[PDB]
Every structure is written in structure tokens, then in C-alpha cells.
Amino acid sequence: NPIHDRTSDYHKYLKVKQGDSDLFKLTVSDKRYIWYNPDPKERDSYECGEIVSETSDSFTFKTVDGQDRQVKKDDANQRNPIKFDGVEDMSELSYLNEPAVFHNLRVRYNQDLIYTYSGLFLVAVNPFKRIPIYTQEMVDIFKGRRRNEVAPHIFAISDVAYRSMLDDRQNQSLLITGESGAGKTENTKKVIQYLASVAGRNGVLEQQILQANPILEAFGNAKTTRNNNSSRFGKFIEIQFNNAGFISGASIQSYLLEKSRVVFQSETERNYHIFYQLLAGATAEEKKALHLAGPESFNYLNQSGCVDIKGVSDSEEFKITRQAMDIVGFSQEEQMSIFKIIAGILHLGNIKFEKGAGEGAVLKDKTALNAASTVFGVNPSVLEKALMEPRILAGRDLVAQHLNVEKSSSSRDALVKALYGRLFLWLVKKINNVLCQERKAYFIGVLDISGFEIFKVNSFEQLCINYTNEKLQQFFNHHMFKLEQEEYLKEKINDSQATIDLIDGRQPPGILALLDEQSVFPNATDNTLITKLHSHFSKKNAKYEEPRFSKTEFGVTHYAGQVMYEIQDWLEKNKDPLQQDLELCFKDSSDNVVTKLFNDPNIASRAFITVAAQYKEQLASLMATLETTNPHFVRCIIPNNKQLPAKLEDKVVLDQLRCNGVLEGIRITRKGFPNRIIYADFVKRYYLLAPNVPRDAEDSQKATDAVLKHLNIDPEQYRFGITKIFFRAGQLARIEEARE
Ligand SMILES: [Mg+2]
């Protein structure tokens, strides 16, 4: 049993190394330390100072350089005794302050232990290097093991959820959030791998479920400056089981796909993988039929300066993508058309509009336009007209307008984005057709979405994702509350709304409601909207802030701190408009897939309700599902902003812990009886402290109370529970600090 064999990879890779002795005496020391900021020239930077003296109210300690510093006891960030360095659950720490928390994580990370629990959370820190802990052999060890029985691991929580499902006959969910590059998708792939193995039918389905993700990653992921394989969409995966606990199906819900990346990428960034995949991967024959060329030949791929990802073979990836498509069930016809769509979008992007003639646009050369039409299976003349001379309703009149270049290009871009987003939707729907079962007994759903987003510039998409995160954090908060009460009961012992409403309130109206309102008027502008927003909430709603000088931004006080959003283009983003003429053009496509994107109301349209109203609706459905499950929380954290291993940056790390709810949870916990130990566990270690108790007594509680009594500990500091002894913050450390 690798769990008992100190020489296994299980041991090397997932546990703190254990030597011969276990004895208390080993960790004994006179030294008491404190965590201090060697400079409030930082604040996540701390150093360990050794208390060299104390007064009845403050401590005095030496710095690294040797300087004596003084601290208020009540302000001291006491260092936990050495024995706690490395614990698998932060809930086991006696002193729960921030630096203390960061220290435990760091000690673990330094040994390549990337997983650590924090109470109900599993904290996962990207190592930025491959650690061989996800082999079948590792899968096996986690089978049927309790949380307390094995090292922290994504497989562990996956197991705990599968067992809960079977035992409680209750659906479950794993919410995996955090920053781009944190490891959400990776951990999500592991959850599914684990499940397919512990519950799979020793298989076509399983194979299909597994191959679905590669398909979706090809079309929804792209290299960004934060992740070579960034998910540009969020997702909720339902892994479906029958009542015997075998995988019976699956479903995928996608959200907020970044359609704009199709038409623009920042420097060093890439468009979606697929484009590169098809271009590298297509057969010298397919190219001819697709009018393909190198990336440098396409405006949609030649602006960023990066057409390739280090250590990635687009051609090889294409092969994997086509394979998945085959496994899942996409017909080669269907497959050709998908590629046609990709090709077509690239041709659309190579369309150059020119002026002069007047103020209106024209197409001198039509090669691009033609290539695009050929691939799409639409009429080039119909296309050309719909782009530059769409018929617009003037109330009674339906008159064609001659758009200028700008407007013309914008339109083209809109066409591309609609094509891309609809295609994606269609892909999801197709995958669901194959995988999904209307006949499921139970499910375990996985949500892999970003956590709060606070960038240099925050826009409509950020507001959406942050709104979701306010709801998830509040979901967490409510849950922690139940679970903690429960705990206390079992042993016999003792702001989101406001932000939420500001955003999605109906009466008085919140941001999205005012946004929808403005959305009804053709002539509204960025300025009309922001003024309206300030009008309703500036100095009037406590979570809102009108800026001192900017005229195009506004701030929302979020759980994670204030976020400033800029309003540019919000009206447009809310309506996501597409000229009706273009809809007409495409509805007549001779392509089999194309036609679905424009003639299936479930793909071609929202309801119509705005983008905001749809987002709010989708989010409420999601929450509603979640509410029916037993949830599990994984907070993935990036160690630094450079994608490097062995470089865990305190400020980078603490800031994520402040935003993702881990430190708040601990704050909450630290206040009561953070430490809770099984009687026998206590004696096993502390027996030697009292002139009385036998390491292995049969009256474990008594035994406990014995030691306690010996030590004259303050009764207020602990609580006799049915199966464990509950200890207030710090108590346990002092106990540990006790002479034998
Ligand atoms: Mg991801």
C-alpha cells in the first residue's frame, strides 16, 4: 500500500517526508518567533523575527539585520511552532494569521506539494512544471479514501464527491475558480479523468466524454500573455450517472465566449487554436479547396506578432482535434463544413474596404469576398450588398444605406463574431446530443470559470464575470455557515446582497437594468449611459463610486475590493447587433452547418432579450442547479505572474487569497474554535506532558482533560466536544510549546 510504503511516489510526491522518529521531543525549542513586515515598504513581505523580550502588552523582537522592533501583542502575527510547518489543512494551524497561512503554503510548495486544504477549501497552487501525480496508479490510491486518510489532491475531493453522491443520493458540484494560468482547466480534466476511471464501464461513452474537451479547447482556447492555453469561455460540465453509480452521460454549458478575439488579438497573443490547427494541419489538397495560405496571409492572424506557441505543434494538434471529432461523432461532411466556416471567417477578415468615390464603401478587388462566399455557400453579390449597403428601416421605409469603410468593416467584424459564436454554440449542442442523457439519476457538475477579474481596464465582460463571482462567493458564505453550524451541533458546542442588487436590481433599477433601458434607444451613447448610472447611484448607493475625473468610468465595490469599469461600447455589447441583411444572406447558405447557425432559433437568437438579461438568466439557472447540490470548492492560485516554477511570490499569492475568500474564511474560523482534535489524536502526542497519562488510554477524553488539567490551561480556551477537543486560536501552539 503506497500509502504505507514510505518509498512510493505517493510518498515522494504528495507527502511531507517522514523520518524514523515521530517523538514530541524532536521539535522542542526555546525560540519564539513572530512574522513582521521588514518594511511597510511592502505588506505581503514579512520576515520572521525572534521575540527577545516582552512586556505585559507588547513583544520585542530582533529583525533579520539585527534591529530590535516592538509590537503590540494584539497586533502580533505569531508564528506557529515548527511542528505545524507542512500541515495538510490550514485548519490545523493554531495561529491563523495571514503570514502564517502564507508560510504553510510556501513550506508545502517548496516540497512540490501543490495541494493543501483550508477548511472546506482545497487550495491548489500551480507548480508550473509537470509533477507525476495523475497516473492511473495515483488514481487507484485515492479510491474510496476519506479526506483525512490521504494527502490533499484533486483526486481526493473528486472521490469524496463521488462517495457523497452514492451515499447521500444527492447531486454534487466542484467549483474550480481562480486566475488565468492558475490551473482550473487542468484540474477540471483531472476531475473528469478520475471519475471516468472510478465509475466508467470498463468504453465508447467515456471515450466520447473525454474527447469532448479537446474539441472545445481547439475552438475556445488561445494563447494569451497569461496562459498558452487560456480558456476564453467558462463552462459548467455535468457528469451524469445512473443509480448504480456508473457514468451514464454528460452535458456542457458554455458562457461568455470572447468572440472579439476572432478579429483582434493583443501583441504576442494568438487567435483561437483552431485557426492555426487547420492552416498547419490541412492537406495540401484541403488548402486548395479552402483557399488557404500561411497565417501571415490573414489579417485575423497576422497582427499580433505571434503565430506560434513554444513547444506546440499546431499540425499535430489538428490531428488530435480531428480525432476527437471522429470519436464524438462528427460526420466528415460536418467536419468539412466546420473547417469551411473557419476558412471563411479568415477570408472575411481579408476583405478590404476602400472609399473615395464619395463617403461610401466599395470593393475594388473581390477575391476575398469570393473565397469567403465559396466556402460559406452564399451569394457574393448578396454578401457584398449586405456588408456595404444594408437595408435599414426608417420606420416605414426600408431603405438601403451605403456604409462607409469604418462602418463597413465593423459590420464585417460583427458577421465574423456571430459566425464564430454560433458555430461554438452549435458545437456544444452537437456534443450534448451525443453525450447527454434525459435519463439521469444523479450528476456531479464541474464549473471551470474565472474567479474575480480586476484588470488594468475592466469592461462589460468583467462586470459579468464579477457579478457571477459575487453570487458564488455568497453561495460559499451561506454554505460555510450551514456546515460550521452543523459541526458545532454534532459535537454539542456554541454584504454581498448590496453589491448584487446594485448590479441586477430591478426596482430601484441596478446597472444592468439601466443598461437595458438605454439599449432600447438607437441614438443612446456611452455618455447617455454613464450619466444615467451616476444619476442613480453617485453618492447615492454605497457600493458605487463616480470617479473624480474620468467621464467614462465608474466603480463598484466588490467582495474582492473596488473595480473600476469603463463604459465604452456597452450599448453595442448589450445588443450584439447584426445587420438583418446579413442574416438573410446566410440563411440561404448552401452549407449544411451554416444554415443551422442562421435558421435554428436556438442558435441564431437569444430569446429578444439583451446580452445582459440573458447573462443574468443563465447565471440564475446555474445558481439554481448549484443550490440543489452538495458543493466542493477548489481555489487554484498562480504562484507569480511569469509562468515560472519555483517562484512563489508572496504578494501575488496573498492578493489571490484575499480575493478568493480563503483568508476571510480563515478570519471567521480563527475567531471561534479553529482547532478541533480527536481525543486519542491529542493524547497520542501530549501524554508525556502530564504526570499521569498513557499514550494509548481508553478514556481518551479523560486523558485529554488530564493533560489540560496538568497544564492549568484556561478553560475558556477549549471546548469538550463529543469526539474532539475544540481549541481557540493559539491555545494548541502553547500546548505544543509545553515541557515534557
Ligand atoms: Mg482554463
Side-chain angles (χ1 to χ4, degrees), residues 1-63 65-67 69-201 203-266 268-315 317-354 356-358 360-436 438 440-486 488-493 495-687 689-694 697-738:
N1 195 350
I3 284 82
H4 327 277
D5 177 23
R6 303 230 266 246
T7 63
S8 59
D9 273 20
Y10 165 81
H11 270 253
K12 222 109 284 127
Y13 304 117
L14 294 164
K15 297 282 301 180
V16 169
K17 202 186 171 72
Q18 297 176 32
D20 294 354
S21 163
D22 39 327
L23 310 200
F24 177 85
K25 209 205 193 191
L26 259 24
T27 43
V28 164
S29 201
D30 11 5
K31 340 243 116 2
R32 294 195 305 154
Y33 306 87
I34 233 235
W35 293 116
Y36 73 89
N37 291 133
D39 259 89
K41 266 237 153 99
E42 294 122 9
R43 149 276 230 310
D44 306 331
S45 237
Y46 290 87
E47 300 263 303
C48 173
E50 151 178 17
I51 309 171
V52 295
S53 119
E54 63 175 271
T55 78
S56 4
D57 52 303
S58 93
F59 302 99
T60 289
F61 63 84
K62 252 141 195 115
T63 62
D65 8 85
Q67 153 209 168
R69 241 179 111 325
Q70 244 186 10
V71 225
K72 246 12 198 211
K73 275 186 164 148
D74 278 79
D75 291 310
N77 298 301
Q78 287 215 271
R79 193 195 153 156
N80 287 291
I82 204 56
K83 154 97 298 201
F84 302 82
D85 281 359
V87 300
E88 297 178 335
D89 184 351
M90 305 273 194
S91 287
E92 294 180 58
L93 311 170
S94 190
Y95 302 127
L96 291 160
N97 55 70
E98 296 183 354
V101 177
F102 180 71
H103 179 61
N104 188 237
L105 215 70
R106 167 190 243 164
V107 167
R108 288 183 51 84
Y109 194 74
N110 286 347
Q111 296 163 95
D112 295 350
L113 299 173
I114 62 168
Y115 301 111
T116 313
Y117 294 121
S118 191
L120 297 168
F121 301 110
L122 166 59
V123 183
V125 192
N126 202 329
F128 278 128
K129 67 176 180 175
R130 298 292 178 198
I131 293 185
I133 50 171
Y134 304 116
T135 58
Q136 177 76 45
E137 286 61 21
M138 291 273 170
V139 159
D140 290 355
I141 287 132
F142 288 87
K143 315 183 13 110
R145 308 222 119 112
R146 324 200 128 67
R147 190 170 121 159
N148 79 194
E149 269 141 49
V150 294
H153 195 300
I154 193 69
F155 285 170
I157 65 153
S158 309
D159 199 77
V160 166
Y162 184 64
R163 301 308 151 192
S164 291
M165 186 187 66
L166 300 178
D167 302 343
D168 296 329
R169 338 292 298 175
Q170 185 175 21
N171 295 331
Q172 303 289 305
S173 53
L174 283 86
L175 283 80
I176 311 190
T177 63
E179 303 198 15
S180 172
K184 301 176 295 300
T185 291
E186 283 315 323
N187 280 282
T188 294
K189 280 180 227 182
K190 299 301 87 185
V191 172
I192 294 178
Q193 152 188 8
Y194 190 81
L195 304 170
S197 154
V198 304
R201 285 206 245 349
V204 192
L205 223 226
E206 287 93 345
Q207 197 72 0
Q208 303 161 308
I209 292 176
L210 298 157
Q211 298 290 296
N213 291 291
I215 300 187
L216 289 190
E217 271 183 34
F219 291 79
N221 284 30
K223 175 207 175 184
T224 70
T225 58
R226 307 189 223 283
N227 181 0
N228 276 199
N229 177 51
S230 182
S231 304
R232 300 261 105 195
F233 61 106
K235 75 182 167 277
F236 185 58
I237 296 197
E238 229 172 62
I239 299 312
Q240 289 167 3
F241 295 94
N242 55 32
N243 54 105
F246 294 121
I247 286 181
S248 40
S251 214
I252 303 175
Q253 172 82 204
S254 68
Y255 300 102
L256 225 43
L257 173 62
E258 183 172 63
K259 307 177 281 158
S260 60
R261 168 170 308 268
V262 180
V263 312
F264 166 81
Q265 310 87 47
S266 344
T268 66
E269 296 205 355
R270 288 220 303 188
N271 203 317
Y272 292 102
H273 309 321
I274 180 126
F275 290 99
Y276 314 87
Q277 294 186 188
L278 168 66
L279 291 182
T283 73
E285 316 103 50
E286 281 166 320
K287 325 146 123 147
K288 146 178 251 221
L290 301 181
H291 299 84
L292 317 180
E296 39 296 307
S297 330
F298 294 107
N299 293 309
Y300 283 168
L301 311 165
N302 71 15
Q303 279 322 296
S304 77
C306 172
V307 321
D308 66 59
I309 302 173
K310 107 161 326 123
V312 177
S313 140
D314 301 293
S315 189
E317 284 306 328
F318 193 41
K319 302 311 124 24
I320 292 226
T321 299
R322 281 228 272 219
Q323 190 122 145
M325 287 195 267
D326 288 332
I327 289 151
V328 168
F330 295 82
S331 100
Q332 289 247 297
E333 254 243 290
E334 283 173 339
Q335 275 173 76
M336 175 77 292
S337 290
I338 288 166
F339 301 143
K340 271 183 240 171
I341 296 157
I342 299 306
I345 281 180
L346 292 170
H347 291 317
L348 288 187
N350 270 356
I351 274 166
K352 158 135 248 171
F353 297 110
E354 296 141 77
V362 265
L363 239 35
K364 239 137 156 152
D365 180 350
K366 293 154 338 156
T367 321
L369 151 78
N370 298 291
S373 345
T374 141
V375 306
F376 292 127
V378 304
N379 214 354
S381 275
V382 186
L383 182 49
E384 206 195 343
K385 267 265 213 209
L387 293 154
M388 331 157 253
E389 211 169 355
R391 288 165 308 157
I392 308 343
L393 170 45
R396 285 231 288 139
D397 295 1
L398 176 77
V399 207
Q401 330 257 262
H402 195 324
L403 325 159
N404 69 22
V405 150
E406 181 257 89
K407 287 292 205 22
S408 263
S409 190
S410 282
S411 193
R412 181 257 315 271
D413 280 359
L415 164 69
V416 160
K417 295 171 325 169
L419 283 158
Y420 204 77
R422 283 175 200 199
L423 169 59
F424 192 88
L425 271 177
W426 184 82
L427 288 169
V428 185
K429 171 161 180 188
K430 294 261 289 95
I431 291 168
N432 284 339
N433 275 175
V434 170
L435 299 194
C436 180
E438 355 121 54
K440 46 145 202 272
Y442 297 100
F443 68 88
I444 281 178
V446 190
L447 178 65
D448 167 11
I449 56 147
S450 133
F452 284 97
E453 276 190 345
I454 307 176
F455 298 155
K456 272 10 218 158
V457 181
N458 310 283
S459 193
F460 181 61
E461 294 75 19
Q462 284 59 59
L463 176 66
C464 285
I465 191 56
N466 281 347
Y467 172 35
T468 297
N469 275 277
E470 282 298 333
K471 278 194 168 191
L472 303 172
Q473 177 58 52
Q474 171 181 56
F475 180 70
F476 176 83
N477 277 318
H478 289 350
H479 185 75
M480 186 198 167
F481 179 79
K482 290 181 264 205
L483 290 184
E484 287 276 283
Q485 264 176 185
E486 267 175 34
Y488 272 56
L489 249 108
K490 288 205 47 271
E491 297 265 329
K492 150 226 126 141
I493 295 157
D495 229 301
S496 278
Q497 200 65 42
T499 296
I500 290 169
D501 292 344
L502 171 60
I503 298 168
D504 74 8
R506 234 200 122 244
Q507 261 315 333
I511 299 167
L512 300 174
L514 293 165
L515 169 64
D516 279 349
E517 182 184 0
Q518 291 269 302
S519 305
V520 169
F521 303 91
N523 308 330
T525 66
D526 290 351
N527 180 259
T528 340
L529 175 67
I530 190 79
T531 302
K532 194 142 233 202
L533 301 181
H534 289 336
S535 199
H536 284 68
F537 310 120
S538 182
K539 293 303 199 178
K540 287 155 193 178
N541 178 301
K543 298 278 187 191
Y544 183 94
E545 162 152 52
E546 173 173 4
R548 273 204 289 166
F549 309 108
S550 180
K551 307 316 248 235
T552 44
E553 289 168 15
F554 73 99
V556 176
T557 299
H558 286 285
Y559 173 80
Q562 177 173 71
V563 181
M564 295 276 337
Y565 294 98
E566 94 171 339
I567 211 74
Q568 189 162 68
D569 298 340
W570 286 24
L571 308 163
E572 183 175 4
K573 290 166 195 261
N574 205 33
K575 323 133 109 240
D576 196 24
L578 179 67
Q579 278 301 345
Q580 170 77 167
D581 279 2
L582 297 159
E583 290 295 24
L584 294 172
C585 176
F586 288 78
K587 263 173 171 154
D588 289 352
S589 170
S590 52
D591 184 281
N592 292 110
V593 169
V594 182
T595 282
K596 296 320 222 259
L597 313 187
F598 296 79
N599 286 123
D600 177 353
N602 281 343
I603 292 172
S605 305
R606 283 188 310 275
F608 303 99
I609 73 178
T610 55
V611 172
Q614 158 191 263
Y615 189 99
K616 173 175 170 184
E617 181 155 7
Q618 309 184 340
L619 164 61
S621 320
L622 166 62
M623 292 308 306
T625 296
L626 295 175
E627 293 272 11
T628 70
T629 69
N630 170 48
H632 309 271
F633 301 94
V634 185
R635 296 318 220 223
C636 295
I637 278 152
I638 48 178
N640 55 71
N641 295 306
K642 300 119 169 140
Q643 302 175 245
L644 296 171
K647 247 280 107 251
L648 188 89
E649 281 161 13
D650 26 49
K651 306 292 217 124
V652 175
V653 170
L654 292 142
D655 159 34
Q656 287 165 92
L657 295 175
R658 279 157 211 129
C659 295
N660 67 6
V662 168
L663 304 180
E664 183 210 39
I666 285 180
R667 262 175 260 118
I668 288 160
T669 288
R670 153 153 108 274
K671 294 186 328 207
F673 296 80
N675 291 152
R676 305 158 192 187
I677 299 103
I678 287 319
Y679 293 109
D681 291 333
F682 184 86
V683 186
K684 122 123 83 181
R685 205 179 166 59
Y686 304 112
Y687 79 107
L689 295 177
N692 255 254
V693 190
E698 31 96 44
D699 187 340
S700 285
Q701 230 180 102
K702 227 298 191 242
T704 292
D705 196 20
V707 178
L708 252 27
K709 253 141 195 8
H710 193 71
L711 318 165
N712 183 207
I713 297 266
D714 173 9
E716 205 55 84
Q717 310 308 131
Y718 60 81
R719 286 290 189 285
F720 279 95
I722 288 169
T723 102
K724 296 171 220 241
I725 213 257
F726 275 50
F727 283 112
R728 304 242 242 201
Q731 190 50 82
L732 223 220
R734 286 202 272 312
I735 268 147
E736 174 67 15
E737 290 169 354

